[PDB]
Amino acid sequence: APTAPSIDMYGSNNLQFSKIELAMETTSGYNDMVKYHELAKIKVKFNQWSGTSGDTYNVYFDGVKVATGAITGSQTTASFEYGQGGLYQMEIEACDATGCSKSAPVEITIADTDGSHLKPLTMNVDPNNKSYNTDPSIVMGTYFVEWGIYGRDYTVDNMPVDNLTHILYGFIPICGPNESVKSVGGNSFNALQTACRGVNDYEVVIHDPWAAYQKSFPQAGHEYSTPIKGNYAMLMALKQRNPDLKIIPSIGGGTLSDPFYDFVDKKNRDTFVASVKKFLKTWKFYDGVDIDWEFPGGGGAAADKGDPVNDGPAYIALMRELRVMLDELEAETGRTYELTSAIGVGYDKIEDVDYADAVQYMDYIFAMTYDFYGGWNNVPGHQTALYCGSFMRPGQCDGGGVDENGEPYKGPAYTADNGIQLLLAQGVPANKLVLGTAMYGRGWEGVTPDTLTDPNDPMTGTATGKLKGSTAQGVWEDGVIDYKGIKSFMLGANNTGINGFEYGYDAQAEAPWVWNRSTGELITFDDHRSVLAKGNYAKSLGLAGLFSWEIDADNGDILNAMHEGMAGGV
Ligand SMILES: COc1ccc2c(c[n+](C)c3c4cc5c(cc4ccc23)OCO5)c1OC
Ligand SMILES: COc1ccc2c(c[n+](C)c3c4cc5c(cc4ccc23)OCO5)c1OC
Numbered sequence: 229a230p231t232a233p234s235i236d237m238y239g240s241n242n243l244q245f246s247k248i249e250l251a252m253e254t255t256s257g258y259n260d261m262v263k264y265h266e267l268a269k270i271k272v273k274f275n276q277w278s279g280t281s282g283d284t285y286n287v288y289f290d291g292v293k294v295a296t297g298a299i300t301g302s303q304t305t306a307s308f309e310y311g312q313g314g315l316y317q318m319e320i321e322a323c324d325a326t327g328c329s330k331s332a333p334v335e336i337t338i339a340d341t342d343g344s345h346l347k348p349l350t351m352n353v354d355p356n357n358k359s360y361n362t363d364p365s366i367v368m369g370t371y372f373v374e375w376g377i378y379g380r381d382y383t384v385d386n387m388p389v390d391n392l393t394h395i396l397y398g399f400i401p402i403c404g405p406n407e408s409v410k411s412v413g414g415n416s417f418n419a420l421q422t423a424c425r426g427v428n429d430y431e432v433v434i435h436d437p438w439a440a441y442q443k444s445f446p447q448a449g450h451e452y453s454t455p456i457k458g459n460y461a462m463l464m465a466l467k468q469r470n471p472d473l474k475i476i477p478s479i480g481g482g483t484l485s486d487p488f489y490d491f492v493d494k495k496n497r498d499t500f501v502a503s504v505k506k507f508l509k510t511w512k513f514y515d516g517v518d519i520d521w522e523f524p525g526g527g528g529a530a531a532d533k534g535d536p537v538n539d540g541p542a543y544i545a546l547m548r549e550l551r552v553m554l555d556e557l558e559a560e561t562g563r564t565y566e567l568t569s570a571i572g573v574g575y576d577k578i579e580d581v582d583y584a585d586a587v588q589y590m591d592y593i594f595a596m597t598y599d600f601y602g603g604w605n606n607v608p609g610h611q612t613a614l615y616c617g618s619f620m621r622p623g624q625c626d627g628g629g630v631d632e633n634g635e636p637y638k639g640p641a642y643t644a645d646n647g648i649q650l651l652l653a654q655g656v657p658a659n660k661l662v663l664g665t666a667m668y669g670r671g672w673e674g675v676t677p678d679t680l681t682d683p684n685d686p687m688t689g690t691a692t693g694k695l696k697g698s699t700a701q702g703v704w705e706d707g708v709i710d711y712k713g714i715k716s717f718m719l720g721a722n723n724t725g726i727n728g729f730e731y732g733y734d735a736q737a738e739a740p741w742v743w744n745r746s747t748g749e750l751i752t753f754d755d756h757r758s759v760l761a762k763g764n765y766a767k768s769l770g771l772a773g774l775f776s777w778e779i780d781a782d783n784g785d786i787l788n789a790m791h792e793g794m795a796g797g798v
Contacts, residue, residue, distance in 0.1 A: 230282025230299075230322040232329040233274035240272045246339035246455035247313060248510065250441050255419075257426035258433035264510040267309035268338050270295075274320055274331070275303050282324035289316035289336070313340025339455040342512035343464025349385055351469075352447060356784030357388035360791040364472075367592065367662050367773025368790060369394035371478065373780065374439045374459060379699055382780035384462035385447050389470050391787050396518050396570075396594070397463070398778070400479045400507075402500065404429040404487035408529040412483055430487055430496045431503035432479060464513045474566060477507070478518040482529055488521040489533040492542045501549050508557060508565070516566030516591070517550060523572045525580030540581040544589075551589040570594040573647025575627070575639035584655035593656065594775050597644035598666040601752060603694030603707020608675055608687045610739035611752040612666040614644045614761055617737035619687035643737070644762070648769070658770045663762055665774055665790060667711045667781040669742075669753030671695035676748040686743045686750050687734065695749060702781070710781035714753055718742040723755075733757060756789045763793020 237243055247268045251261040272287070281302055287295040295308035299322055306320065318336040321328045339345050362368065372395050376382040387395070401409070403424035410417040416435075423433040434440045441458035444450040448465060450457045456464065463475055480488060490496045508514055524543045526534015547567065554565040567590045571577065587593060601609030610617050616625035620641055623629015627637040640646045644663065651661060674692025681688040697703030702713020719742060720726035729742040729749070738761035743750045754762075766774055774790045776782070 229280070229326045230324050230329050231276040231279040233276055233285065233304075233320045233322050233331045235318075235320065235331060235334050236273040236275055237334070242453040243272070243318070243334065243336045244339070244453040244455050245270050245310075245337065248339065248341055248456065250456060251437075252442055252457075255422055255437065258423050259426050261437055262434070262510065264341075267311045268313075270306075270308050270310055270336075270338075272306045272318070272320065272336075273303065274306065276322060277302060280324065282322040282329075284323045286321045286323065286328070288319045288321070288330075291317075310338060313338050313342065313344040315345055337455075340512065341456070341460075341464065341510060343461075343467050346461070346465040346468055348469035349462060349465035350447065351387075351389065352385045353388050354386070354784055356788075357391060358784070358788050358791075360391060360788075360795070362391075362791050362794055364393070366794055367393055367775065368787075368794075369396060369594065369662060369773070369775030370779040370787070371396045371398045371775075371777050373398045373778050374436055376778070376780040377439050377443070377459065379704070380780045383445065383447070384459055384466060385445075387779055388784070388787055389466060389473060391791060392473060393773070394474045394476060394775070395463075396476050396478045396568075396775075397459075397514075398478045399435065399481040399484050399520070400432050400477045401435050401484040402479065402487040403427045403431055403433060404490065406484065406486050408483050408486050411529070416483070428499060428503075430490070430499040432500070432507050460511065460513070467513050474515040475513055476516045476518045476566060476568060477511075477514055478520050478570070479504070480520040480522065482522045485520070485522045485528055486530050486533065488524075489526075489530065489535065489539070491546055492535060492538045494545070497542070497546055497549055501546075501553050504550065505553050505557065515563070516554065516568065518594070519546070519550070519567075519569040521569070523577050523580075525577065527572075527576065536580050543581055544586045547586045547589040566591040568592040568594060570596055573597055573644070573651070574600075574642050575646065575650055578647065578650045578654070579639075582654065583651055587656045587660050590660065592660055592662050592772055593651070594662045595644070595647060595651070595664055596777075597647055597664040598754075598777060599670070600642035602670040603672055603691075606672065606674075606691035606693065608672060608689055608691060608750055609642075609752070610687065610734065610737050610741075611670045612644070612664075612754050612758070613734070613737035613739035614758070614765055615737050616641050616643055616646075617687055617734050617739060619682070619685055619734075645765070648771075652769075659772055661771045662773055662775045663766045663771050665759055665762060665776040665786060666754045667776050667778060667786045669709045669711065669714050669751035670707055671709060671749060671751035672707070674748040675743070675750040677745055679748075685734070686732070686741065689748070689750070691750070692748070695751065709751060709753075711753060711786055712781060712783040714742065714751060715783055715785065718751065738762070754786060756785060759786060759789035760793040760796070763790060763795075764797030767794065767797035
């Protein structure tokens with residue numbers, strides 16, 4: 229016979245509670261901003277404004293008692309803990325010696341990072357992406373980048389997820405030496421320094437917490453009280469839509485690889501492996517780990533780093549130790565966790581690692597079969613070709629010849645097939661190898677007719693510098709252009725060339741280009757024809773599948789060709 233409680237929804241954080249506590253209104257150290265609790269802290273205010281309040285309250289979720297306490301006046305705060313994420317029908321009852329009176333039920337939310345409190349995500353995918361019936365055993369991967377939500381305006385709901393088996397989320401940095409990040413200019417180093425305040429060196433952190441979990445996305449129904457927002461809440465709602473889709477954080481990349489060179493000290497691996505375990509127990513929508521160390525032995529962004537004697541053994545030991553750790557997680561959760569890595573495939577990268585040994589611990593190797601040539605110098609070539617191009621010299625394909633100095637080639641040329649053949653020869657199984665497709669071009673200025681040695685092949689010319697362009701044409705940095713920008717502004721609808729560009733295809737390499745004879749602008753990229761050739765190649769050798777870099781740069785054509793290529797090769 230007390231008065232039945234009324235729940236104070238606004239005084240109770242809108243009944244939005246969470247196993248994870250995330251700073252929403254600051255940018256600080258990662259340990260300061262993110263705290264994951266095994267039990268969510270629940271605090272519910274209720275009122276009994278008239279009649280008697282009684283002496284004790286009970287709280288029910290879906291009819292089960294989860295808390296009790298004292299009522300002492302006309303307003304009570306019920307504080308307790310609860311361990312399971314989800315949406316529940318909550319009732320609060322007030323009691324005295326004569327009996328009990330229950331509130332009407334109200335939905336309470338307990339967020340967890342597997343997205344168990346969320347509806348399936350609503351998609352907004354460009355309809356140029358077609359539907360396919362591709363064998364689900366074939367890998368079809370892509371990278372989604374954390375910063376694609378800014379100028380590129382490409383959000384998680386834009387991904388053609390029914391055409392994907394694996395989303396690699398780029399990139400998770402590691403605290404410690406990161407001079408290469410500084411060299412990129414902008415805010416990227418400063419953001420990292422902030423995220424690492426109060427964090428041990430060699431531990432992982434989130435680079436941009438605004439993009440990852442603070443930014444409110446209207447399309448995902450985020451409201452002020454939503455306890456998890458950003459890309460990560462959207463990936464959580466994506467897992468409810470597509471439970472078999474693997475979503476994997478990619479650690480490192482070209483500019484964030486500096487700390488890996490200290491992994492020759494096992495204490496630094498232990499610190500890192502432990503922080504990755506904690507990271508996956510914190511963000512449960514993730515299904516494994518991808519290690520993008522560019523590169524064991526060196527030759528990447530860090531000019532003064534690289535140890536060709538010890539980096540390969542360190543990489544293999546790292547893979548062994550991550551697999552141990554992931555097996556602990558599989559035991560704790562009942563889930564499968566995957567271990568993968570994206571790797572350089574020039575012969576001088578491959579020779580520094582015994583991949584046949586490393587790969588026994590791994591599910592997949594994503595072969596970076598792109599960036600073979602690029603704006604960093606003035607030598608044109610196909611950046612993502614399957615085979616050796618018409619432009620190459622005698623003995624250059626297999627490395628048995630001499631260059632224009634008369635200098636012996638130090639190894640076989642940079643092509644996808646040479647890279648893949650070198651891995652198979654070390655004894656990596658074909659069915660663990662994933663072949664990469666570029667969703668972007670690299671290019672140059674100043675490759676005019678007078679520089680060519682063969683007048684029908686601009687890959688025989690010489691450049692004056694990197695391609696220049698605006699973000700409106702998909703050029704986010706010098707010498708790189710989105711495939712969707714190439715299609716809009718250089719190929720046009722009929723794929724024959726606009727705005728002074730012509731299209732060419734090197735049938736021996738399996739590689740397209742567009743060339744503007746007057747500016748000497750030349751761009752090397754993947755198109756519908758080269759991507760069908762890559763799918764036939766992957767089929768012929770019994771590779772795991774295909775992957776691409778990066779998804780925001782496609783308009784549908786590249787991913788469609790990946791699926792069409794894997795249906796039809798032979
Ligand atoms: C011939 O010696 C050199 C000298 C400098 C570099 C290099 C290789 N890479 C990948 C980079 C590099 C790679 C980057 C970058 C910046 C970079 C800046 C310099 C080099 O930002 C993203 O990726 C190299 O190859 C062994
Ligand atoms: C010593 O001369 C240099 C100077 C700069 C570079 C370089 C070689 N590579 C491969 C790169 C490079 C490679 C990249 C990249 C960015 C890059 C940026 C600079 C260089 O993005 C991913 O691939 C080099 O050796 C030819």
